[PDB]
Amino acid sequence: STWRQNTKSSRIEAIKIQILSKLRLETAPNISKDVIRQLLPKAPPLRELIDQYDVEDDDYHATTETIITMPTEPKCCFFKFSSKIQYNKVVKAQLWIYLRPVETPTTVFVQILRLIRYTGIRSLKLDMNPGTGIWQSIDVKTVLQNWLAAGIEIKALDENGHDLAVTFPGPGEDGLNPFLEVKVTDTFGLDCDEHSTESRCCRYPLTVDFEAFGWDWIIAPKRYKANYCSGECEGPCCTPTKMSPINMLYFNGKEQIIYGKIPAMVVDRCGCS
């Protein structure tokens, strides 16, 4: 009997305290088998509740809400192909472009085309005044989805034919490159036997027998597989990372028989935390 048997014993003591605590009982109901014979109804609802004992979510990895893609590195602009994205998971897709500040007030003709051999997606007419450059966002949700089930040209010319759109950024144009802003809606264990030589954090078998405790106030289940965790972690602590409930039919010691769901009574998985 090593540290593992000390973990098995303390698990049995924990289950005993947990059962009364979770069932809101200060003490184990003082009801003998002789009293249960008189009070337990010999009726279909009890037989049914007793006969029942004869018979997915990724919460670890991160969830990507927004993806911002810069153009791949002369020609412009081609976008990424590495990240996996769904056709119907796209909530919003906007192409952001920066227009350089103008020396004199002019009209700006913005033209975005999807390359194949050329199909128009959006055309804008802007009025720009001297002072500062401006960020223009273009809805590309329909196009972004169309390419997911399988190159963007950007032009922003003023009245003189000069292109104001920053595609390949010149000196002092840091963080002014075009980009796609895409918003999306996207959301085991180790088991051992009692005599395992395994030193790592592991799940071991444990059957809890309420008749062995003398807890006759519990009608069903008379026994259940509770399991326990034991092993070295090198968090530095072998604990359950997944637990499941049990249904219990019991005498509450207040002239009542209750059927209920007790959470976290069975160890499903062990881990280091």
Phi, psi values for residue 146, rounded to 5°: -60, -35
Please give the Cα distance from 50 to 23 (Å, whole number): 19
Q: From the CB of residue 135, how many other CB atoms can be counted at a distance below 10 Å?
A: 9
Q: What's the token pair of residue 195?
A: 């005599």
Indicate the SS3 state at residue 124.
strand
Please give the Cα distance from 108 to 130 (Å, whole number): 13
Smallest distance, its own copies to C-beta of residue 158, A: 21
Q: Count Cα neighbours of 167 within 13 Å in the Cβ-side half-sphere.
A: 18
**Residues in region 209-238 near Cl ion by CB under 5 A:** 209, 212
Nearer to its own copies by C-beta: 106 or 230? 230
Contact 211, 233 (CB under 8 A): no
Name which of its own copies, Cl ion, none residue 209 binds, using a CB cut-off of 5 to 8 Å depending on partner kind.
Cl ion
Nearer to its own copies by C-beta: 119 or 239? 239
Place of tokens 């990895």: 61
Nearer to its own copies by C-beta: 66 or 142? 66
Residue 139 in the binding site for Cl ion (CB under 5 A): no
Smallest distance, Cl ion to C-beta of residue 15, A: 9
What burial letters (b/e) apply to 73-108, b meaning 16+ CB within 10 Å?
eeebbebeeeeebeeebbeebbbebbbbebeeebeb
Site size for Cl ion, by CB under 5 A? 3
Name which of Cl ion, its own copies, none residue 57 binds, using a CB cut-off of 5 to 8 Å depending on partner kind.
none
Smallest distance, its own copies to C-beta of residue 21, A: 8
Nearer to Cl ion by C-beta: 153 or 181? 181
Name which of Cl ion, its own copies, none residue 32 binds, using a CB cut-off of 5 to 8 Å depending on partner kind.
none
Nearer to Cl ion by C-beta: 211 or 232? 211
The footprint of Cl ion (CB under 5 A) covers 208-209, 212
